[PDB]
Design a protein around this nucleic acid. Structure first.
Lengths: 97, 78, 54, 77, 83
DNA sequence: CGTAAGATCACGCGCGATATCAGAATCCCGGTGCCGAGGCCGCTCAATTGGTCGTAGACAGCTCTAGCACCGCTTAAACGCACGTACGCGCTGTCC
DNA sequence: GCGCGTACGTGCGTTTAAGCGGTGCTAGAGCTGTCTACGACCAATTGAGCGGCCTCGGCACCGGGATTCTGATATCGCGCGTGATCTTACG
């Protein structure tokens, strides 16, 4: 049959909140880090541990930001997060101007 | 390259963050925010590594970088 | 608290998820490590009320 | 830039607050003044964030849930 | 002399002016008590740190540098009173 | 006696909760392998004590200045009510 | 977008404790002189943590079986609407 929209989303929320493994596949993230670093200094080498630490910090920060975004969206009587939500959360945080 | 952070990966991250419904422009906004965060952290890490006169950016450089940004991380030789 | 959590999760060896549960569940330890992200720590299970089915 | 909180009620409030941590405590007037400056800067910033929250709700009147949201996002408790 | 209910020394017009400097135009009714509570918590924390600093200083008077140090601790550094 | 208005029972139609089937989730258990955890032995490298020196800290005494208190005066600041008006809340149409 | 309930602004009236000054008393802070305890260092001594190398197992994985949970449908129940029968009023 068909699951009504919004139920499988709750199932994934339950699934991913019980687990800790990283949600971004490694190699694209590593290539993105390498590209970003290249603009600061050339012919650079990275320890896999450094790259893993970068991924852990980035994913945790993104999860916290998504939590704040969901809270902001709920405050607007809304269920869907939209860019203004991220913007407001970042603004109140003080990272974005 | 930056697009390598797939739309579904962003959905998984949001799901772990407790989000149920996600907008289309979200994904691009998150790509931008992640770009900015990585830019800052990697800039500090490079600054450290350059000051170390090493061609290899090390994990301790990364840890010091997040410590500067008030985003302390554990599990990599704190 | 980590061993307590590991017993709750029925594990003999403490893994970082146990540490994250112990720190975040405890209000005072969570306040102490307010600006610390624990690798492979994950998040506590928490779903907003309005997101739940009716 | 002049202060909005009136000086004497603030001084009495602070004296009570400090008394509850420890009795028989005296204050330099400059210390009270610095406390008031810090408090006013903090709550003006908080009101700014509250107004930002209220607009985000398609509202114009700030409501208590707005400050709760702002303080949660600030990481305060 | 005992001190009691000085938190109400923060009158409604004072909080209203304060919000005005914060850009707020329309203010809800119950807001005022919540601003009193938030100011209460902030004062509690800052004065806790300042009182501890005085206690190490073995002084019976709070000095301005104590307040400045406590504010620096809270990530709320202040200029204009030393330090 | 004959017709018209009202109450009650029988029958029919509509909205809500709760019995069932059924595919997808989840938990438990038999049986195997492993890379990480745990312990023993060597080895440097670390901790401790005999004994010394200047150094910082503790203590006591003299000086006094802003800290504290009250009284009188003046007045800017605070509180209660008429009201009506834009704001808040609730129902509804549309289509993204 | 429409409709309705209403919280509080301005203004007015009323009242009051917050600032200025004027006096008066004063607490412990700040600045000199005395006096003394201790940690770095050097020699020399002794011993413990780290690493290498063995040995062992709690859980992942595979595979299978058993128990649970939405989506759909249908019956019971209650509520509303209509016709038939009994009752009353009028002609």
């Amino acid at each position: 049959h068909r699951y009504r929209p919004g139920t499988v989303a709750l199932r994934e929320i339950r699934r991913y909140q019980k687990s800790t493994e990283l949600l971004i596949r490694k190699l694209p993230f590593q290539r993105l880090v390498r590209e970003i670093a290249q603009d600061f200094k050339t012919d650079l080498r990275f320890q896999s541990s450094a790259v893993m630490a970068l991924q852990e910090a980035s994913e945790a920060y993104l999860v916290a930001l998504f939590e704040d975004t969901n809270l902001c969206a709920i405050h607007a009587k809304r269920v869907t997060i939209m860019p203004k939500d991220i913007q407001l959360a970042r603004r109140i945080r003080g990272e974005r101007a | 390259n930056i697009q390598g952070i797939t739309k579904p990966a962003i959905r998984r991250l949001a799901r772990r963050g407790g989000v149920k419904r996600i907008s289309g422009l979200i994904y691009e906004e998150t790509r931008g925010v992640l770009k900015v965060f990585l830019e800052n952290v990697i800039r500090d890490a490079v600054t450290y590594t350059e000051h170390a006169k090493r061609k290899t950016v090390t994990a301790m450089d990364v840890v010091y970088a997040l410590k500067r940004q008030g985003r302390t991380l554990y599990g990599f030789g704190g | 608290l980590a061993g307590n959590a590991a017993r709750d999760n029925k594990k003999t060896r403490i893994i970082p998820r146990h540490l994250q549960l112990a720190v975040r569940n405890d209000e005072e330890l969570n306040k102490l490590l307010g600006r610390v992200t624990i690798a492979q720590g994950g998040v506590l299970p928490n779903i907003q009320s309005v997101l739940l089915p009716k």
